[PDB]
């Protein structure tokens, strides 16, 4: 018994490709479209909620996840792989940062830790790479707002705006025409909804769309009062009703 | 390193012409408090061996479980478990002796003094002692605790050496044991009146007597 | 083609061992169904005992995981019991560590995470089972959460699993289109069990004796399975209407 | 064919080829015979040399004062297994003051061989053993195969051309079982048994190996001029 | 068992080559070119970003050039994720040396250890090697300015000028032509940019597809300064040499 | 293909061919049975007499676990012994922690999970035995049969080995003709008959019969081997029925 | 841990991984060792497809293991660092316990033992390196030259060469080296070593390295001009 | 590929059988046992004339009463010798006596099968272990990578073994003197060797009860070579 697979399952082919990473990116291509847009005073991340059955309650399945009070994540590719990555990402923000410095990690460094975890699944013994690409949006005091993409290889890139998954090629082109460096957060939400309608086929409402923002601090969502320096999470998930309000003036 | 909590006092025994007798009272002491009165400190193993235990009772109950398990383990893949390959008194002893000495060598002893009494397959009498230190010895009479000081002198008047064993009957031997138990009730501050007695004979087998009482006592003389 | 033997990606980004584990799910040829009432959650499953030499009372695919959580399995019994024992152990440890009963959805996530690991780690095969967890959660109320060999999980208004799952699924869909609500609007669990059996009969097109079915019911503070005579009593009530 | 790469693989008909290949190493080994009466048990072994300049490979190993075996196949594997038996016999004496039953000895060898047939990386043992002994239930003879199978017998033989001796003992069963209280006659029967497995070669003084254990006889081995009596 | 699925990453070919190392080098040859040039009064690091998109955030980005300590930097060619694993190890190693000896680590010592880690992945453990080649640029008070390169084999060498990644053959010829020993930093800046501009697979070399850095003693008196160029500064230096 | 070369690998059907191959090793083995009765269980097995040189009564195949459970198996005999050794460890640790002897259903799952574990990895081989086992606990009698896949159920009667179909047919008749129940002493006699009837499928070598039983009334809830007068009586009953 | 037996026997009785490691040595740059009456000289080829090199900082081909022993090699450069490091550590460990520096034979025996261990250990491949180890034993003036190879075998040589085209330079040394009269001086020994490399090298410019080891920890590396004088002198005598 | 500890269909271990082929490629080693002592001789076989032949060490001391000669992948023998020396010295520490030659040989042979998936492969070298003890006198053993050892009156291993062994079959008798054995090893080595035998490319050694294990000088062997040539010409 015991894990006898102590050797790499991802290896270089004669042409220099890393097969399993390439094939993981192929799994991401098949995945449902998700996107992220960076505004001057915030960031928006969005995706379609592909329901497996109409008897299924799609509210119980969250594609957009809070990592820290100021950082959120969305993905394209394999859901189960994403779910465990969120678990690990939430924990590493505490173990390798908050328990040391008494504050939450800046976006770039949390992204760096997730990237490390994904790199190790590419080199360690007896494992396949993760079959997901992540889009991580967040805010921190000294870097402001930021948006990052993390691929199965472990590589990460900062973006003004981007898309991943099914119809990413068309969605990226759409975003290039609409994006400028003076966009306000509400303008970025509007563009996010427009971009997503192109890739969505069936119903397009607040129940089939999942959308969250990184913006102003929300004191009402903090849960307590009395500490002036604590002002609340910048991450907020938009409600089904809040999405439909913006779909009328579309 | 331990300290004993709930304890049992003397275990006494002797050889006679056809077998061995062993006895021990039914008390579980908690320091000076005579706390438990239904405690059986003689444990039979098969129909040919009785193990008598004094000292810590929690450790006694552990040894009970070990012996119980030994009977189970011996029966495994053993068609002669109730015949030629049944547990002998000598096997049961050597096992316990090994365990006792190993535990003392790990500085975590089983806080007990133990006497294994029985009859071997060839008819020979078996009687041997072992304690928390792993010290072992054999003699025509054996006793633990206070019994060593008060019972042995009385039992040695009946069987003083090897040649006295064939000359001693079961009636004479049991009489000496029962008398010794009375003397211990007079003089040991941690003895009870109630006790158990076991005879292992090469002809009549194992006779286990429960709920015996010390009687015919002399006090009338203050 | 060793990419089909272990859980590594194929050129098209697929995991064949996971896909083949899904096909093992139907190896028993049994269909299960779960619905929610106002106060309860009912799960029913077919019971097929082909051999006359079998003790029918020992043939079961419904498990009592904890006092509040029940679980029905679609798949081979060895893997089913493997999943059950782990779930029982996990639910017991959760209560010890965190001081309250493990919720149905949290246990579902945990078992789904374990399944995910087998899809990523090579030395461990996926279990060829689909696990349906039911309870009346003290926060979320009547709950149905389902796990598969891919490590996927989600909550359900109602659900079905097995070879003829699609027929049962649409039958339930059409009812909830009509009723316009998320559950069975019924007071007693007895009539929710009757609803569950009635709609399984319509979807599968077969009649059931007392020994052809297996019923689990979750209420507040306990999950329990029904006896043959409890089901017979329930079958009589359907027939007399 | 495709299912003989390791012991952890079953063939489509339910066979373990690595175990069967280990069984084959025994068949190539030199013949050895075992037989018993009610009072004694006897091993007889034909020893094999490399050439006329070499010694003759020893086939019989003592395990305890009351137990021992003969080997056919890979000799180093017999050394590992005999050493294990020596320890188990010894554990029984030190802990329980009890001579290890020949039957338990068999059960222990079975379970040690089995573990090497169900795990990756290992290999089956490549040797067969004939264990003789005298314990509390009289004389015994066991046959060990590296598949794990252990069998109690009145008589038997393993190695190349062992079928000749095995047939002879099957005929002689009623005679040799009642050779009680006579060592030299029980050996004579075993020496006559092993003779049915000889081809072109005959039993010489540095070729024959005999062992005996019984009621009033410790396990002792005879070689050299001590076996000249039986040729 | 699992033997069936083992690639055997750490074995020799019949010709005496290491398959996985050779294939990792083949991977690196498709990565964006990186150049290092050592002058008498400083070092230049220049690297080309892999085909950029217009919506990429260029200023808050790091792909090619990384800081190891205040005196040493590296240019990367290969898998970025792999490189960051090695960069963090190198960063820690530098701090260990400083903690032990109270002196900044000599460049070669850091380069040797990082190269020794790469070597290990080719001899034992059954894992794939790191698909990365580094150009090390640094200063210490023993040898002054130094350039090194390491590759997946774990072999390292020193250079006056060197390139890694794509088109190294063409790049090395051009550097070998125009390089001379008495060269200054500002001349080396020009040589680096001119070489990339001629070897690039792109249509024209622009500011948004470059990372640039210098290591000068151009601070104030006997001390070394690392300058990782900002986007606008690369735009200016590209105009100053007349490439755009 | 190649899906059958490694244990724990799913075929495109959703099958583990290595386990199915282990079943072939079981089908090759000698016949063994189990009969559930009024207040207990009875086990019996066929022992092929390969040679005159085999000592009668001295190659015992039925094994006891704890003091109340009996186990018999068909297939690779060493594999069966390994399973019983584990069974004895499992039963010992249960009794150690919980005091009471292990219930039969509890014991059944301990073997089940252990056998199932040997279908999860390619570094181990599945068990080459089907095991019939059972005994008496606080809730009465229980009979079980466990297969290489880890699958097990409760049984009124059970059979495995080369003569399983013959024995199954004979078992079904007893279930039909005795709805109220079969007595322990009757079940011993019937067990002998069924082994003799199932021996028709292995009739080159003649055989040796071995029976054991657990009964609340007859053996006081403990596992015992049937020997002497009761065995010969059961043999004679079987001999009369084949003629 | 990774366990795979990578070095195994083949039907013909060869260990291919060890033999393929020898092919890596054959690919490496040429190295030569010649011992005189009172010295040992280690010569090494450096390939000239690498211009723009920085020779100040580039790893030298001949490495000091201790102040009295040196080690050169042919084969995989990265592999050689591991052997050199281990040897240097054993050198200091020997001084610590025995209170005497290593003999050249002992240091060689250790390095060879390491190489052998990597030929029958699981999860590892053999070293793609052969070494020349030269020096003088403590308080001894007799020159020592040893050779090791991937298999683990080692032996002493009056003169020896390893690496690419080593068979050509071995041919030269076999007819130009007299056992009865080894190079009597330092000059004679360096010249014979440079001559032997000139059979294989190309230009005698920055392609040849020469290191001279004399008794009592007297080791020095020759510069370009010093070596170039030998190259210039040899060519003028050749035109005859 | 396939397991390292795999059996062939004929019941032999592949890796052990393949290591035996490596030993056939090795240089010749011969041993002869007499009542006056045991002689061990080897072919050095230098690969080049520039190699200093006296550094070729294929005869080796294990203890004062036990010597050893090798043939095959000789680098593999180092750890075997190291174990043998430790075993011999350790036994002297534990029992204040010399260890029996057979017990030494058995200890070395225990290492042999300790390979698999322990070391990664069998040893590629065969050993001739020669010694003396009080119980069984002068002894010669042949230790193989199979874990098997045979006692021999005389034995040859290596490339010239089967031809040399047939020669030893004819020449050996139970009354050979030590001097007779020395000449016999030289004679048989000269027959099977490629290059012409002399004191530089062949090495002799012996173990006697009185003087223990001794490797001969090149001067001493040279005179035995001269004595051998003169005796063959004398009839
Ligand atoms: Cl989890
Ligand atoms: Mg897997």
Swiss-Prot record, chain A:
Keywords: Cytoplasm, Isopeptide bond, Nucleus, Proteasome, Ubl conjugation. InterPro entries: Ntn_hydrolases_N, Proteasome_alpha, Proteasome_alpha-type, Proteasome_asu_N, Proteasome_sua/b. It comes from the Eukaryota. There is a cross-link at residue 108 (Glycyl lysine isopeptide (Lys-Gly) (interchain with G-Cter in ubiquitin)). Belongs to the peptidase T1A family. The proteasome degrades poly-ubiquitinated proteins in the cytoplasm and in the nucleus. It is essential for the regulated turnover of proteins and for the removal of misfolded proteins. The proteasome is a multicatalytic proteinase complex that is characterized by its ability to cleave peptides with Arg, Phe, Tyr, Leu, and Glu adjacent to the leaving group at neutral or slightly basic pH. It has an ATP-dependent proteolytic activity. This is Proteasome subunit alpha type-2. SMART domains: Proteasome_A_N. It is found in: Cytoplasm; Nucleus.
Curated annotation (Swiss-Prot), chain B:
Non-catalytic component of the proteasome which degrades poly-ubiquitinated proteins in the cytoplasm and in the nucleus. It is essential for the regulated turnover of proteins and for the removal of misfolded proteins. The proteasome is a multicatalytic proteinase complex that is characterized by its ability to cleave peptides with Arg, Phe, Tyr, Leu, and Glu adjacent to the leaving group at neutral or slightly basic pH. It has an ATP-dependent proteolytic activity. PRE3 and PRE4 are necessary for the peptidyl-glutamyl-peptide-hydrolyzing activity. This is Proteasome subunit beta type-7. It is found in: Cytoplasm; Nucleus. One of its GO terms (cellular component) is proteasome storage granule. The keyword Lipid metabolism does not apply. Its main location: cytoplasm. Belongs to the peptidase T1B family. Keywords: Cytoplasm, Nucleus, Proteasome. Present with 16900 molecules/cell in log phase SD medium. The 26S proteasome consists of a 20S proteasome core and two 19S regulatory subunits. The 20S proteasome core is composed of 28 subunits that are arranged in four stacked rings, resulting in a barrel-shaped structure. The two end rings are each formed by seven alpha subunits, and the two central rings are each formed by seven beta subunits. The catalytic chamber with the active sites is on the inside of the barrel. Interacts with CIC1. The keyword Repeat does not apply.
From Swiss-Prot, chain F:
It comes from the Eukaryota. One of its GO terms (biological process) is proteasomal ubiquitin-independent protein catabolic process. One of its GO terms (cellular component) is proteasome storage granule. It is found in: Cytoplasm; Nucleus. GO terms for molecular function: mRNA binding. The alpha and beta forms are probably products of the same gene with different post-translational modifications. Keywords: Acetylation, Cytoplasm, Nucleus, Proteasome. The proteasome degrades poly-ubiquitinated proteins in the cytoplasm and in the nucleus. It is essential for the regulated turnover of proteins and for the removal of misfolded proteins. The proteasome is a multicatalytic proteinase complex that is characterized by its ability to cleave peptides with Arg, Phe, Tyr, Leu, and Glu adjacent to the leaving group at neutral or slightly basic pH. It has an ATP-dependent proteolytic activity. Present with 12000 molecules/cell in log phase SD medium. The 26S proteasome consists of a 20S proteasome core and two 19S regulatory subunits. The 20S proteasome core is composed of 28 subunits that are arranged in four stacked rings, resulting in a barrel-shaped structure. The two end rings are each formed by seven alpha subunits, and the two central rings are each formed by seven beta subunits. The catalytic chamber with the active sites is on the inside of the barrel. Belongs to the peptidase T1A family. The gene is PRE10. The chain holds residues 6 to 248 of 288 of the full protein.
UniProtKB/Swiss-Prot annotation, chain G:
Belongs to the peptidase T1A family. Present with 16800 molecules/cell in log phase SD medium. Disulfide bonds: none annotated. This is Proteasome subunit alpha type-4. GO terms for cellular component: mitochondrion; nuclear outer membrane-endoplasmic reticulum membrane network; nucleus; proteasome complex; proteasome core complex, alpha-subunit complex; proteasome storage granule. It comes from the Eukaryota. Its main location: cytoplasm. It holds the Pfam family Proteasome_A_N. The 26S proteasome consists of a 20S proteasome core and two 19S regulatory subunits. The 20S proteasome core is composed of 28 subunits that are arranged in four stacked rings, resulting in a barrel-shaped structure. The two end rings are each formed by seven alpha subunits, and the two central rings are each formed by seven beta subunits. The catalytic chamber with the active sites is on the inside of the barrel. Interacts with CIC1. The proteasome degrades poly-ubiquitinated proteins in the cytoplasm and in the nucleus. It is essential for the regulated turnover of proteins and for the removal of misfolded proteins. The proteasome is a multicatalytic proteinase complex that is characterized by its ability to cleave peptides with Arg, Phe, Tyr, Leu, and Glu adjacent to the leaving group at neutral or slightly basic pH. It has an ATP-dependent proteolytic activity. The modification Phosphothreonine is found at residue 58. CDD domains: proteasome_alpha_type_7.
């Amino acid at each position: 018994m015991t894990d006898r697979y102590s050797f790499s399952l991802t290896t270089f082919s004669p042409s220099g490709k890393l097969g399993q990473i390439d094939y993981a990116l192929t799994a991401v291509k098949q995945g449902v479209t998700s996107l992220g847009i960076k505004a001057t005073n915030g960031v928006v991340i969005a995706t379609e909620k592909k329901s497996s059955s109409p008897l299924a309650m799609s509210e119980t399945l969250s594609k957009v996840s809070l990592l820290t009070p100021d950082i959120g994540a969305v993905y394209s590719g394999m859901g189960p792989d994403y779910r465990v990555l969120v678990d690990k990402s939430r924990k590493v923000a505490h173990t390798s940062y908050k328990r040391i410095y008494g504050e939450y990690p800046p976006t770039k460094l949390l992204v760096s830790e997730v990237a490390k975890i994904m790199q190790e699944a590419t080199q360690s013994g007896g494992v396949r790479p993760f079959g997901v690409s992540l889009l991580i949006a967040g805010h921190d005091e000294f870097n402001g707002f930021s948006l990052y993409q993390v691929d199965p290889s472990g590589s990460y890139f900062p973006w003004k705006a981007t898309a991943i998954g099914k119809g990413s090629v068309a969605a990226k082109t759409f975003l290039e025409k609409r994006w400028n460096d003076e966009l306000e957060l509400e303008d970025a939400i509007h563009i996010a909804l427009l971009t997503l309608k192109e890739s969505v086929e069936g119903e397009f409402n607040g129940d089939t769309i999942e959308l969250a923002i990184i913006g102003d601090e929300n004191p009402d969502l903090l849960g307590y009062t009395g500490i002036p320096t604590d002002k609340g999470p910048r991450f907020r998930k938009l409600t089904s009703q809040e999405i439909n309000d913006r779909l009328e003036a579309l | 390193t331990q300290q004993p909590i709930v304890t049992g006092t003397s275990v006494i025994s002797m050889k006679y012409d056809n077998g061995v007798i062993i006895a021990a009272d039914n008390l579980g002491s908690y320091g000076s408090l005579l706390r438990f009165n239904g405690v059986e400190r003689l444990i039979p193993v098969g129909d040919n061996t009785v193990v008598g235990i004094s000292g810590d009772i929690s450790d006694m109950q552990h040894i009970e479980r070990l012996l119980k398990d030994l009977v189970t383990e011996n029966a495994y893949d053993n068609p002669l478990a109730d015949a030629e390959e049944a547990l002998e008194p000598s096997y049961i002893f050597e096992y316990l002796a090994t365990v006792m000495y190993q535990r003392r060598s790990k500085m975590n002893p089983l806080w007990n003094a133990i006497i294994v009494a029985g009859v071997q397959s060839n008819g020979d009498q078996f009687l041997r002692y072992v304690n928390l230190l792993g010290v072992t010895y054999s003699s025509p009479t054996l006793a633990t605790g206070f019994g060593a000081h008060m019972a042995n002198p009385l039992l040695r008047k009946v069987v003083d050496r090897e040649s006295d064993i064939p000359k001693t009957t079961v009636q004479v031997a049991e009489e000496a044991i029962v008398n010794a138990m009375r003397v211990l009730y007079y003089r040991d501050a941690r003895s009870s009146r109630n006790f158990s007695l076991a005879i292992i004979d090469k002809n009549t087998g194992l006779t286990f007597k429960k709920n015996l009482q010390v009687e015919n006592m002399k006090w009338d003389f203050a | 083609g060793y990419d089909r033997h272990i859980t590594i990606f194929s050129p098209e980004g697929r995991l064949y061992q996971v896909e083949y584990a899904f096909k093992a799910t139907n190896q028993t040829n049994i269909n299960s169904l779960a619905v929610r009432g106002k106060d309860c959650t009912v799960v029913i499953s077919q019971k097929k005992v082909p051999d006359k030499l079998l003790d029918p009372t020992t043939v079961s695919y419904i498990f009592c995981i904890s006092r509040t959580i029940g679980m029905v399995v679609n798949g081979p019994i060895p893997d089913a019991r493997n999943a059950a024992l782990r779930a029982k152990a996990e639910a017991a440890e959760f209560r010890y560590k965190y001081g309250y009963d493990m919720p149905c959805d949290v246990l579902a996530k945990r078992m789904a995470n374990l399944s995910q690991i087998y899809t990523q780690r090579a030395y461990m095969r996926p279990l060829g089972v689909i696990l349906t967890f039911v309870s009346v959660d003290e926060e979320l109320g009547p709950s149905i959460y389902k796990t598969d060999p891919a490590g996927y999980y989600v909550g359900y208004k109602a659900t079905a699993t097995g070879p003829k799952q699609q027929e049962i699924t649409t039958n339930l869909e059409n009812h909830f289109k009509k009723s316009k609500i998320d559950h069975i609007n019924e007071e007693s669990w007895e009539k929710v069990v009757e609803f569950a059996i009635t709609h399984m009969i319509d979807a599968l097109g077969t009649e059931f004796s007392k020994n052809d079915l297996e019923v689990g019911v979750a209420t507040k503070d306990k999950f329990f399975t029904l006896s043959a005579e409890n089901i017979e009593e329930r079958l009589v009530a359907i027939a007399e209407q | 064919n495709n299912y003989d790469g390791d012991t952890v693989t079953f063939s489509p008909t339910g066979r373990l080829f690595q175990v069967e290949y280990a069984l084959e190493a025994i068949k190539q080994g030199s013949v050895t015979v075992g037989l018993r009466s009610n009072t004694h048990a006897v091993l007889v072994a034909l020893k094999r040399n490399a050439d006329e300049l070499s010694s003759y490979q020893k086939k019989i190993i003592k395990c305890d004062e009351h137990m021992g075996l003969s080997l056919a196949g890979l000799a180093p594997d017999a050394r590992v297994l005999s050493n294990y038996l020596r320890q188990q016999c010894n554990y029984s004496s030190l802990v329980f003051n009890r001579k290890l039953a020949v039957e338990r000895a068999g059960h222990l060898l079975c379970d040690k061989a089995q573990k090497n047939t169900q795990s990756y990386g290992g290999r089956p043992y490549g040797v067969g053993l004939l264990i003789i002994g005298y314990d509390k239930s009289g004389a015994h003879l066991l046959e060990f195969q590296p598949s794990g199978n252990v069998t109690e017998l009145y008589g038997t033989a393993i190695g190349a051309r062992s079928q000749g001796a095995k047939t002879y003992l099957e005929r002689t069963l009623d005679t040799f079982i009642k050779i009680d209280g006579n060592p030299d006659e029980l050996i004579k029967a075993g020496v006559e048994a092993i003779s049915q497995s000889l081809r072109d070669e005959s039993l010489t003084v540095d070729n024959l190996s005999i062992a005996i254990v019984g009621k009033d006889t410790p396990f002792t081995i005879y070689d050299g001029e001590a076996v000249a009596k039986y040729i | 068992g699992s033997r069936r699925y083992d690639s055997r990453t750490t074995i020799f070919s019949p010709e005496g080559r290491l398959y996985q190392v050779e294939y990792a080098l083949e991977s690196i040859s498709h990565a964006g070119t990186a150049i290092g040039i050592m002058a008498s009064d400083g070092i230049v690091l220049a690297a080309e970003r892999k085909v950029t998109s217009t919506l990429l955030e260029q200023d808050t980005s790091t792909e090619k050039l990384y800081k190891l300590n205040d005196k040493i930097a590296v240019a990367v060619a290969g898998l970025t994720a792999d490189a960051e694993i090695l960069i963090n190890t190198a960063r820690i190693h530098a701090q260990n040396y400083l903690k032990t000896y109270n002196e900044d680590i000599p460049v070669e010592i850091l380069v040797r250890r990082l190269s020794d880690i790469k070597q290990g992945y080719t001899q034992h453990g059954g894992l794939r090697p790191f698909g990365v080649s580094f150009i090390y640029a640094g200063y210490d008070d023993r040898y002054g300015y130094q350039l090194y390169t390491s590759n997946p084999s774990g072999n390292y060498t020193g250079w006056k000028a060197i390139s890694v990644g794509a088109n190294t053959s063409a790049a090395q010829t051009l550097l070998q032509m125009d390089y001379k020993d008495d060269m200054k930093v500002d001349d080396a800046i020009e040589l680096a940019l001119k070489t990339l501009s001629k070897t690039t697979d792109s249509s024209a070399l622009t500011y948004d597809r470059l990372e640039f850095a210098t290591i000068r003693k151009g601070a104030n008196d006997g001390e070394v300064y690392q300058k990782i160029f900002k986007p606008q500064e690369i735009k200016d230096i590209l105009v100053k040499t007349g490439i755009t | 293909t190649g899906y059958d070369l490694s244990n724990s690998v799913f075929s495109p059907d959703g099958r583990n061919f290595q386990v199915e191959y282990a079943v072939k090793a079981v089908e090759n083995g000698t016949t063994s049975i189990g009969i559930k009765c009024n207040d207990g269980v009875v086990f019996a097995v066929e022992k092929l007499i390969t040679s005159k040189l085999l000592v009668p009564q001295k190659n015992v195949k039925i094994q006891v676990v704890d003091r109340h459970i009996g186990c018999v198996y068909s297939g690779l005999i060493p594999d069966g012994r390994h399973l019983v050794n584990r069974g004895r460890e499992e039963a010992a640790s249960f009794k150690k922690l919980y005091k009471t002897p292990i219930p039969i259903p509890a014991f059944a799952d301990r073997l089940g999970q252990y056998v199932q574990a040997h279908t999860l990895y390619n570094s181990v081989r599945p068990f080459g035995v089907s095991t019939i086992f059972g005994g008496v606990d606080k809730n009465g009698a229980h009979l079980y049969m466990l297969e290489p896949s880890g699958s097990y159920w409760g049984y009124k009667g059970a059979a495995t080995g080369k003569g399983r179909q013959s024995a199954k047919a004979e078992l079904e008749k007893l279930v039909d003709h005795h709805p109220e129940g079969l007595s322990a002493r009757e079940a011993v006699k019937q067990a002998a008959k069924i082994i003799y009837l199932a021996h028709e499928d292995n009739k080159e070598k003649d055989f040796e019969l071995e029976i054991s039983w657990c009964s609340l009334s007859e053996t006081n809830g403990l596992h015992k081997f049937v020997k002497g007068d009761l065995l010969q009586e059961a043999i004679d009953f079987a001999q009369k029925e084949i003629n | 841990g990774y366990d795979r037996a990578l070095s195994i026997f083949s039907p013909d009785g060869h260990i291919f991984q060890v033999e393929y490691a020898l092919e890596a040595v054959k690919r490496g740059t040429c190295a030569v060792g010649v011992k005189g009456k009172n010295c040992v000289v280690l010569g090494c080829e450096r390939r000239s497809t690498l211009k723009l090199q920085d020779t100040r900082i580039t790893p030298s081909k001949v490495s000091k293991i201790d102040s009295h022993v040196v080690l050169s090699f042919s084969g995989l450069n990265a592999d050689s660092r591991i052997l050199i490091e281990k040897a240097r550590v054993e050198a200091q460990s020997h001084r610590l316990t025995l209170e005497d520096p290593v003999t050249v034979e002992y240091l060689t025996r250790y390095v060879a033992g390491v190489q052998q261990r990597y030929t029958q250990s699981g999860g590892v491949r053999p070293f793609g390196v052969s070494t020349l180890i030269a020096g003088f034993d403590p308080r001894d003036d007799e020159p020592k030259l040893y050779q090791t190879e991937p298999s683990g075998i080692y032996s002493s040589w009056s003169a020896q060469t390893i690496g690419r085209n080593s068979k050509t330079v071995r041919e030269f040394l076999e007819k130009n080296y007299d056992r009865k009269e080894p190079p009597a001086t330092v000059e004679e020994c360096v010249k014979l070593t440079v001559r032997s490399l000139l059979e294989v090298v190309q230009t005698g410019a920055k392609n040849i390295e020469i290191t001279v080891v004399k008794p009592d920890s007297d080791i020095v590396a020759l510069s370009s001009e010093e070596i170039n004088q030998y190259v210039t002198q040899i060519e003028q005598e050749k035109q005859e | 590929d396939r397991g390292v500890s795999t059996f062939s269909p004929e019941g032999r271990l592949f890796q052990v059988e393949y290591s035996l082929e490596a030993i056939k490629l090795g240089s010749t080693a011969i041993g002869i046992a007499t009542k006056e002592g045991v002689v061990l001789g080897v072919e050095k076989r230098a690969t080049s004339p520039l190699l200093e032949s006296d550094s070729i060490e294929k005869i080796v001391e294990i203890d004062r009463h036990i010597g050893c000669a090798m043939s095959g992948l000789t680098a593999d023998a180092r750890s075997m010798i190291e174990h043998a020396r430790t075993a011999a010295v350790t036994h002297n520490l534990y029992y204040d006596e010399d260890i029996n030659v057979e017990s030494l040989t058995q200890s070395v042979c225990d290492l042999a099968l300790r390979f698999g998936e322990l070391m990664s492969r069998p040893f590629g070298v065969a050993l001739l272990i020669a010694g003396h003890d009080a119980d069984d006198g002068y002894q010669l053993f042949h230790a193989e990578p199979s874990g098997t050892f045979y006692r021999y009156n005389a034995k040859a291993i290596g490339s010239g073994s089967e031809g040399a062994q047939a020669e030893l079959l004819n020449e050996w008798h139970s009354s050979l003197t030590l001097k007779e054995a020395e000449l016999l090893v030289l004679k048989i080595l000269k027959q099977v060797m490629e290059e012409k035998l002399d004191e530089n490319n062949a090495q002799l050694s012996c173990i006697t009860k009185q003087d223990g294990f001794k490797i001969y000088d090149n001067e001493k062997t040279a005179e035995l070579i001269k004595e051998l040539k003169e005796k063959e010409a004398a009839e």
